[PDB]
Amino acid sequence: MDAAEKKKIIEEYATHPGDTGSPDVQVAILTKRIAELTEHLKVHKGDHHSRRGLMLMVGQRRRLLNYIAKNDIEHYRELIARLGLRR
Amino acid sequence: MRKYEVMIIIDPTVEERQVDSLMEKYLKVITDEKGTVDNVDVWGKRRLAYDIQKKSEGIYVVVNATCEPATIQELDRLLAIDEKIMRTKVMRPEIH
Amino acid sequence: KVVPIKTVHIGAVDYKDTALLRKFISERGKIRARRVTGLSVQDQRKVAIAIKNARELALLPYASTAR
Amino acid sequence: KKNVVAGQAHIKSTFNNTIIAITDPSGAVISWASAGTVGFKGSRKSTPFAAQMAAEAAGRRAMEHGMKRVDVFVKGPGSGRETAIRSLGAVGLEIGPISDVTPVPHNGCRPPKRRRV
Amino acid sequence: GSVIKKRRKRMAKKKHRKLLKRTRIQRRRAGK
RNA sequence: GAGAAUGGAAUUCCUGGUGGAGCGGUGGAAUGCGCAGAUAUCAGGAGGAACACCAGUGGCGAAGGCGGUUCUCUGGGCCUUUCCUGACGCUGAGGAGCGAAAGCGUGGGGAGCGAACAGGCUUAGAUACCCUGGUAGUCCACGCUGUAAACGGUGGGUACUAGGUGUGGGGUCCAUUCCACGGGUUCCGUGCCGUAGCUAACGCUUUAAGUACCCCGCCUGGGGAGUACGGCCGCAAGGCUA
RNA sequence: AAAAUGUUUU
Ligand SMILES: [Mg+2]
Ligand SMILES: [Mg+2]
Ligand SMILES: [Mg+2]
Ligand SMILES: [Mg+2]
Ligand SMILES: [Mg+2]
Ligand SMILES: [Mg+2]
Ligand SMILES: [Mg+2]
Ligand SMILES: [Mg+2]
Ligand SMILES: [Mg+2]
Ligand SMILES: [Mg+2]
Ligand SMILES: [Mg+2]
Ligand SMILES: [Mg+2]
Ligand SMILES: [Mg+2]
Ligand SMILES: [Mg+2]
Ligand SMILES: [Mg+2]
Ligand SMILES: [Mg+2]
Asked: How far is the CA of D5 from the C1' of F46 (A)?
């Protein structure tokens, strides 16, 4: 998250070239952040405050995915298929 | 590639030449992996505000170097394992 | 109160720079309180951190003791 | 026996009594006195007069040991500090830089529980 | 609060805890 | 917030020098320590724990809470004119996690402090206060426990309803600068005073305990009782439901 | 500095 791969993620998950805040981009960014924080917590199992931040990110991503699936179910399926298949 | 400032307090018995040799070898271990060294300043011998390892004076060095966190940590552990340097401090000015 | 103690500005703190740290250290060797040093909260915090660093790094005494 | 000339003084005044130590600047003590040594015992050895007596006794013995003007370090939250200073002055020898060598923790060790008198 | 209510509850709790301490063994032999 | 390294003072202990009769402690004492050299004093060393000043009228965190310094890793907040998505919001039974201190398990550590304990005092007695000692514990690693006056005794969200006056954070504007001192203004905190209003009163009052809407928890006289029985959780202490 | 207590009238 030195903004390099963040911009990369924004551009390769954007719906249109100017898109930077749509639910797809938000879910992609949140998933990358959840992965990074999961690794950090695996290193530091005792970081309860960061784990709470991780849970907040998880819930936010869940609500965004719920909105996406409520609007366009096939788009939701494609997005989650790209993003870890929702296991 | 962040930038750090290391202040080094070297045993006062050092009288030139070997201080430069130590600085050269530590800058070498910095520069072995893309770690540029911006500046090295030798304040010289100064009286310590309090005794450090039974020594009333010390040689002061300031090293401004841009490098990786792993490289700066490895330089710090080298300075720690060295027996010829009284103290080290590694500042990272967040702005400059 | 404390407004009569006019706010003082210092610029860069630079724990190496002993002049400012001496100006803000007490005659006994302690860190002066904010209401007597006339610094903003951020400047006072930076001055205190710099004083602690200089103390640990031998540029300043932990306590000047006898005057 | 031997003339030490300069010497120095340590005035440890606590809430219970006062102890005076005249010592060689090398740290070796030349003479010493306390309220317990000079007569007083128990509660009545915390008084400033007890510190007066002890300080003058220590100063006198240091004098027949041959000891001139003193640099003095005082320590402790007692009451006999100044009085002992006067006492040394009255017995007569130039007093120099009265110090404040009393210790002070940086939190450090935990203090004992608060008394519940 | 009059602190009397807390004192009444305090005494009830303390008496029950004393009962538990004195009957600790019997409860674990047969019961809770 | 987590990890690692590391700084100085102080206490205690150790070694040595010096020195000699007490030291210590209290309302007063004694137990205790001390000519087998204590207390004191100086030098050197070991070790554990807590971080003076900065430091509060302050900051941060969902709460519990958080203060030596440095680096590494990481969470959230605030502001901004543009930019993007386009109601994606709010609350949330059950459930899950976090949750001071004490406590528990295995191992480590142990300076100081200190339940229990021993002794001395006080006392009619003193299983206390006070004094001298002092073990668990306090500390670390990994678990467990899951309770507090865990309190603002005030659930979360939102809109509206005089002001006055401190203070913390981000902008922006102005004059002299071409810094900053200063004033404004805006957004978000955090106090105090105070109007309308509310309240049994005390008091609250834009950080509501006012005027309203949404959702959750909870109350129905005092004891018996947060007890019994049952069940769940726990190694236990016990907790929860009741 | 510690220094306790106060049955049943009608
Ligand atoms: Mg840890
Ligand atoms: Mg303070
Ligand atoms: Mg406050
Ligand atoms: Mg549009
Ligand atoms: Mg639960
Ligand atoms: Mg604990
Ligand atoms: Mg344990
Ligand atoms: Mg153990
Ligand atoms: Mg005791
Ligand atoms: Mg609390
Ligand atoms: Mg409650
Ligand atoms: Mg709620
Ligand atoms: Mg409300
Ligand atoms: Mg406000
Ligand atoms: Mg009400
Ligand atoms: Mg129960």
From this structure: 37
Q: Residue E29's Cα: distance from chain center in Å?
A: 19
Q: Does residue D14 sit in helix, strand or coil?
A: coil
With respect to residue B96, please indicate whether it lies within any of the assigned structural domains. no
- Report DSSP letters for E1-32, one per residue: --SHHHHHHHHHHHHHHHHHHHTHHHHHHS--
User: Taking CA atoms, what residue in C is nearest to D102?
Assistant: C65
Asked if residue D66 lies in contact with residue D4, where contact means CB atoms within 8 angstroms, the answer is yes
Task: Check which CATH number belongs to the domain holding B9 and give it.
Answer: 3.30.70.60
- The count of structural domains within chain B is 1
Among all residues of chain B, which has the CA nearest to that of C59? Answer: B49
Structural domain span for residue B24: 2-91
- Beta strand B2-10 pairing with B55-67: antiparallel
For C38, the 3-state DSSP assignment is coil
The experimental resolution of this structure, in angstroms, equals 2.8
Of D31, A53, B16, which Cα lies nearest the Cα of A44? Answer: A53
Distance in angstroms (rounded) separating the CA atoms of residues C17 and C45: 16
Residues of C with CB under 8 A from a CB of B: 15-16, 53, 55-62
Token pair for B20: 């430069």
How many CB atoms are closer than 10 A to CB A80?
A: 17
Helix (H, G, I), strand (E, B) or coil at C53: helix
Q: Ligand 10 center to residue D107 CA distance, Å? A: 24
| Cβ contact B52–C56 (<8 Å) | no
b or e along C15-32 (b: 16 or more beta carbons within 10 Å of the residue's beta carbon)?
bbeeebbeebbeeebebb
Kindly list the partner chains of chain B, i.e. chains with 3 or more CB atom pairs below 8 Å.
C
Q: What is the dihedral of CA D86, D91, D94, D96, to 10 degrees?
A: -40
